[PDB]
Design a protein around this ligand. Structure first.
Ligand SMILES: CC(C)OC(=O)C1=CN(C(=O)c2ccc(F)c(F)c2)CC(C)(C)c2c1[nH]c1ccccc21
Length: 221
């Protein structure tokens, strides 16, 4: 069902998606026998910095992204960093772990210097989106779609972003039909999550209200 053009777009995206730290690289670090809230916060700051570094690089390689106006490119990166981080956290969180460990993961993140006001919403999101049983390809495409969002603040040429976003949505809709052929609702389910992710922008802003040179550059703190 993917056209040849679509197959190659997907392939370039998965090549670049596959350069991130594996879920266990992240999750082994938090779950190790020796734990403190203090080192775990520093640990999370490091992981957030690497996530942004890897996202920056993902935008260099994302087909068409570097044909955009340079200022718009930076604005898309800054407008999408936090949403991208939470989506990847959902993907990571839903990967199988040894006995007791997903419970342990959640409890440590809950005792890392950040209040329950933020943490509870975020784990409900991870578990809910987890029940959709998205493939790696769906996560990758939905990430690209988040980044190429024409309605971000400060974009000068919104039509230019739209022209790259629409082909990605077309690919995603095919992937949903390929991967869950008996679930006609799937694509609409993922459209929903596009909007739900945006709620995290406010929480994170709040959370920070209560860092590394890259995070200072991209989060603007
Ligand atoms: C691994 C990448 C994709 O994600 C992270 O970096 C974040 C992960 N976050 C997760 O919840 C997360 C982290 C690790 C996991 F293994 C997981 F399943 C979920 C969220 C948050 C807000 C706790 C956090 C994130 N980083 C923070 C930095 C400072 C302060 C807070 C954070």
């Amino acid at each position: 069902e993917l056209t040849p053009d679509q197959q190659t777009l997907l392939h370039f995206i998965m090549d670049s998606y596959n350069k991130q730290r594996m879920p266990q690289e992240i999750t082994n670090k938090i779950l190790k026998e020796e734990f403190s809230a203090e080192e775990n916060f520093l640990i999370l700051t490091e992981m957030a910095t690497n996530h942004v570094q890897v996202l920056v690089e993902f935008t260099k390689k994302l087909p068409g992204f570097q044909t955009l106006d340079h200022e718009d490119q930076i604005a898309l990166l800054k407008g999408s960093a936090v949403e991208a981080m939470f989506l990847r956290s959902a993907e990571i969180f839903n990967k199988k772990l040894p006995s007791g460990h997903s419970d342990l993961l959640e409890e440590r993140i809950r005792n890392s210097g950040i209040s329950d006001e933020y943490i509870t919403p975020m784990f409900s999101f991870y578990k809910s989106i987890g029940e959709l049983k998205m493939t790696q390809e769906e996560y990758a495409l939905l990430t690209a779609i988040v980044i190429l969002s024409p309605d971000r603040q400060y974009i000068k040429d919104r039509e230019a972003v739209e022209k790259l976003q629409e082909p990605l949505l077309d690919v995603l809709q095919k992937l949903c039909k390929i991967h869950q052929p008996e679930n006609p609702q799937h694509f609409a389910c993922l459209l929903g999550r596009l909007t739900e992710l945006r709620t995290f922008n406010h929480h994170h802003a709040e959370m920070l209200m209560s860092f590394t040179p890259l995070l200072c550059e991209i989060w603007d703190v």
